[PDB]
Write a protein that binds this ligand. Structure first.
Ligand SMILES: CCCCCCCCCCCCCC(=O)O[C@H](CCCCCCCCCCC)CC(=O)O[C@@H]1[C@@H](NC(=O)C[C@@H](CCCCCCCCCCC)OC(=O)CCCCCCCCCCC)[C@H](OC[C@H]2O[C@H](OP(=O)(O)O)[C@H](NC(=O)C[C@H](O)CCCCCCCCCCC)[C@@H](OC(=O)C[C@H](O)CCCCCCCCCCC)[C@@H]2O)O[C@H](CO[C@]2(C(=O)O)C[C@@H](O[C@]3(C(=O)O)C[C@@H](O)[C@@H](O)[C@@H]([C@H](O)CO)O3)[C@@H](O)[C@@H]([C@H](O)CO)O2)[C@H]1OP(=O)(O)O
Ligand SMILES: Cc1c(/C=C/C(=O)O)ccc2ccc(O[C@@H](C)c3c(Cl)ccc(F)c3Cl)cc12
Ligand SMILES: Cc1c(/C=C/C(=O)O)ccc2ccc(O[C@@H](C)c3c(Cl)ccc(F)c3Cl)cc12
Lengths: 575, 565
């Protein structure tokens, strides 16, 4: 199962890697020469013992130290080169994975974000994309280098004492099965301790975060005894974790030791020790010893690699997720702003009570309409629907054509959102007022935008004034100032359809007559949809609609609904 | 001086277990000795086994190797188990100590530091200390035994070559020094992605996909460059070090050529001498880096002694109250958060007559929440006096005082356990499951509990991954209801009001607030208008108050405040 899953996942990833195939190829050749350094250095023992102590000083003297120094230079160079090439390929593929995930997540449905913590996604894309590369790199390096060295060593063993090698080979399958069984018995118990440590973490974190309810409700004994239990289980699982390998390693090298001691017990018998010499035994047996590390490394590569692909899969699924549905094909430059809800009903995902039902309303160009009604109702939902954050279930919302006929980009350039909870990207004030159009709007343009939004009183108080850096997640700006900055954005862009949210707005602003003048100047021109909560806007609004339980129950003018004096006057009395 | 004083402050926690350390130490000694005895055997094999003596190649070697390997494996297993046992015991003792102590600290301690930082103190630092110190001990003993076991063999089998190597060791040391000396962007990646996911709403309108894509491009590529840089630096270091060592060894071998030397050497003598020289390269590497790891361990440990030496909140109150159906009163209370010098609360006087619900409204940042924080004595005041039943809150022992208050807030933490057990938190045995279940429906929390797979015995699993914002709130109400606490503190600033079933929560509050003292940081219109007294807070002071004939018109701020929300 999992070999197949991991291999299809890998064939998915190879497109991302193939552009850096040159780096891969180079690293591989360097690894080959690296393994040959070691092979050719172990060969150097034969001429040393036989000739250099068969009465010849030239060997030990002139060249042997020279060749060793040169081989070590070669080893170091192959080492550094392979290291660098692999680290380069990995850096590239990791960064590529990350740009893919970022670009994709940016284009996801809003439902995807309100539901998931920003963190989990952020953490996964930084950690997993690095792990895929680490595991893949290690696996490749192992196969190449150590599979080259086992070849070198097997051939050398066969040239020097063709006989002894086969005794090792015939022993190989049963030794392999023995080692594999011993390995599978004990060492495969990381997740046990991962669970237990997750419990340690959970207890500690619940106590630290919920410190205040522990204090009020007096659960110190409960939390304590709980930690006493889980920490001891964590201890015991750490000890079982070590015991696994403490038991499995000596056993395994003992098995290999038996195989080698049999080979050596044949070294004493006459048929083969006659042809051979004291220098050949040395190189052959040292080859066999050297082989133990490559064999160990190679028989764990599937573990390493399948792990890498198991993380690559969690990245791939995020990529496979469905992005925002966008099939408009219609584009509009500077819409007029004639927005009409016809028979709109809509229920948020997962819920079972519609946030809106049979909603019918009409907003003509250049004029405003206030959505007042019991807090918690669907006026906010109405606002959210015009931007296609959520697709209605039944009916149709028209802009001049159904919103879903329009490209999301074109549809969204028509809409300007002014609320207190606007996001302040950490950057200059000017670049926050001209978020994604720094190239299109002049400095004087931005200056006048901020002036007309009655924001310059608190900008001129900044450190560098208008070029001061707001952000750092918005500490430097209060809400009454965030509103005016949002208003500056909207004035600059001069979008044809405004969505104004005074719900979250703070009317407790030392400067709110200025916020009111900014709004008056903002909405002179264009269609406006206010989730109203101010005396000023409901005073000047062209139409007031009263919403409860996702239904429009009364429509009319302020004065006409007070002459009427029905539900609107009930709200008037209440607020 | 500090690096060792910290270890001696720590040694008391370890000394109960020195019994394992010494056993591990002997095992390490014998392990080094086994590895040395095999290099010893190297000479008999060659010389004797091919001084025309199959006696050695059949008898000596095949069985002595197996014996030595058995001993090696057992010494390894034993030292492993001993060190692991002691290390587990100390990390357990220390994690338990830190959990208890941190829990006993005041809220002033938690405001400064992140919760995740304090969690790291328990999960990692406490393990890193024992890790680094265990590794220090093992390196010291094991490799300090191997180094001498090898040096002896070296000088014995050929004093000539060995002194030649020793005379070179100083220069080699200085050289490896000079090169091992030559041995933010991640924050920008996490930030560039996090403030994208934050402003996804603002990125979709204004069309900020392009500018964000290229911002990321920049940041990601910059960290890729940094990440390659570090590995390149690390990579080059060791090749050069191996080259240096190999130079010295090649010179030694050029020396073995001279006839005065070679004559002493045999096929086996030189073999084992150079074998031990090479083996010595890993003891030396380990023995030069050991004090660095001890340093980092003891630094992590003095971090935790900084935590342990901090003081737990003060509970000198010797007064107990079984239960207090009584009023809480603020008498000219003034407060300033430690570290700030502008009082969050100036001269304040506030009465919450028993049974009555006093709803206090105030601007989001104001000291309205500070009041409810003061009643439970999360912080002590600077001037004034808070009386519960006409006696200073500080007169009481904190346990009794907090038994009288129940907190209800959306963000109330739900601890990984059964729904039922969360409702009877810290008093699971006291209340019968009938009491619990009644408390559950009385809070309208049952509408969603039976939907759960095991209902009331379903466990909130994986740090609270199951429940909704609005569900936690009804569970908190159930907890306070069941406990039936005289003083109700109801936090509605964190409430998250827009929910699927808010009428349920509202009626739950209706039931809870009734015939019970309630002090609510109110945002809801309903809990406000049907409250006994409304109290406005502006900055550190109270501006104006009002009942039901005054709720009609307030002199101060209430008009605009009510108009905003
Ligand atoms: C003799 C001999 O072989 O010398 C050879 C000469 C050949 C003739 C040279 C070697 O050097 C190379 C060897 N391979 C060759 O082809 C030549 C290789 O062999 C490893 C063996 O391990 C056993 O452990 P034990 O001592 O038995 O416990 C020892 N016993 C045997 O082999 C018995 C056998 O019967 C022979 C034995 O030593 C000995 O005792 C020798 C002694 O027995 C001989 C006497 C009998 C020897 O050391 O070591 C790597 C270095 O490994 C990295 C690396 O660069 O790959 C991997 C890294 O692995 C770990 C780790 O072990 O710490 C894994 C951990 O899980 C992890 O926590 C950490 C890290 O994550 C922490 O952050 O790294 C670590 O080893 C590191 C070290 O430098 C210091 O960390 O280097 C060297 O590669 P190279 O640099 O490319 O050449
Ligand atoms: C020692 C060893 C490990 C290592 C596992 C670990 O260290 O965890 C892993 C896989 C192996 C597969 C075959 C095998 O066959 C023996 C006959 C053999 C060969 Cl073919 C060559 C040289 C030898 F020395 C031996 Cl003994 C030994 C193996
Ligand atoms: C190889 C090595 C490391 C390791 C550094 C690293 O790996 O980072 C660290 C410190 C050293 C100090 C002296 C030294 O002297 C050489 C001549 C020597 C001796 Cl005295 C004994 C046996 C030998 F095999 C060698 Cl070569 C070598 C050292």
């Amino acid at each position: 199962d999992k070999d197949l899953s991991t291999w299809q996942t890998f064939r998915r990833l190879w497109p991302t890697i193939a552009p850096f195939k040159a780096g891969l190829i180079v690293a591989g050749v360097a690894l080959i020469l690296n393994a040959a350094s070691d092979t050719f250095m172990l060969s150097l023992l034969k001429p040393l013992l036989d000739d250099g102590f068969g009465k010849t000083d030239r060997s030990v003297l002139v060249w042997m130290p020279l060749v060793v120094i040169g081989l070590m230079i070669l080893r170091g160079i192959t080492s550094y080169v392979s290291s660098y090439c692999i680290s380069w390929v990995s850096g590239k593929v990791v960064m590529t994975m990350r740009r893919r995930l970022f670009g994709h997540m940016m284009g996801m449905p809003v439902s995807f974000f309100d539901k998931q913590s920003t963190g989990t996604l952020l953490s996964r894309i930084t950690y997993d994309s690095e792990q895929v590369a680490s595991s893949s790199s290690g696996a490749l390096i192992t196969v190449v280098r150590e599979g080259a060295s086992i070849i070198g060593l097997f051939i050398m063993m066969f040239y020097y004492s063709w006989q002894l090698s086969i005794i090792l080979i015939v022993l190989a399958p049963i030794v392999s099965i023995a080692i594999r069984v011993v390995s599978k018995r004990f060492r495969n118990i990381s997740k046990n301790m991962q669970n237990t440590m997750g419990q340690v973490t959970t207890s500690a974190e619940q106590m630290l975060k919920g410190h205040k309810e522990v204090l009020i409700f007096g659960g110190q004994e409960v939390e304590t005894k709980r930690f006493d239990k889980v920490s001891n289980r964590m201890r015991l699982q750490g000890m079982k974790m070590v015991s696994a390998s403490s038991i499995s390693d000596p056993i395994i090298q003992l098995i290999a030791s038996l195989a080698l001691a049999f080979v050596l017990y044949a070294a004493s018998f006459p048929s083969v020790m006659d042809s051979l010499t004291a220098g050949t035994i040395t190189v052959v047996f040292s080859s066999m010893i050297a082989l133990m590390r490559p064999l160990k490394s190679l028989t764990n590569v599937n573990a390493q690699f399948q792990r890498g692909m198991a993380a690559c899969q969690t990245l791939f699924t995020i990529l496979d997720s469905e992005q925002e549905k966008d099939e408009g094909k219609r584009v509009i430059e500077r819409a007029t702003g004639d927005v009409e809800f016809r028979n709109v009903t809509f229920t948020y995902p997962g819920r079972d009570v519609p946030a809106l039902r049979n909603i019918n309303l009409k907003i003509p160009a250049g004029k405003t309409v206030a959505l007042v009604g019991r807090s918690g109702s669907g006026k906010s939902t109405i606002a959210s629907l015009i931007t296609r954050f959520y697709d209605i279930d039944e009916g149709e919302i028209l802009m001049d054509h159904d919103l879903r006929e329009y490209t999301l980009a074109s549809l969204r350039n028509q809409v300007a959102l002014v609320s207190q909870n606007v996001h302040l990207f950490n950057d200059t004030v000017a670049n926050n007022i001209a978020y994604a159009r720094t190239e299109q709007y002049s400095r004087e343009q931005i200056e006048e935008a901020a002036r007309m939004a009655y924001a310059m009183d608190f900008i001129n108080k900044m450190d560098n004034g208008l070029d001061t850096v707001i952000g750092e997640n918005g500490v430097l700006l209060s809400g009454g100032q965030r509103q005016r900055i949002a208003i500056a954005r909207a004035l600059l862009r001069d979008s044809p359809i405004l969505i104004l949210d005074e719900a979250t707005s703070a009317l407790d602003t030392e400067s709110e007559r200025a916020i009111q003048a900014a709004l008056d100047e903002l909405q002179k021109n264009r269609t406006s949809l206010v989730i109203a909560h101010r005396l000023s806007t409901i005073e000047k609004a062209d139409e007031i609609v009263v919403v409860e339980d996702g239904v429009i129950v009364e429509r009319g003018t302020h004065n006409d609904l007070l002459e009427h004096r029905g539900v609107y006057a009930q709200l008037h009395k209440m607020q």
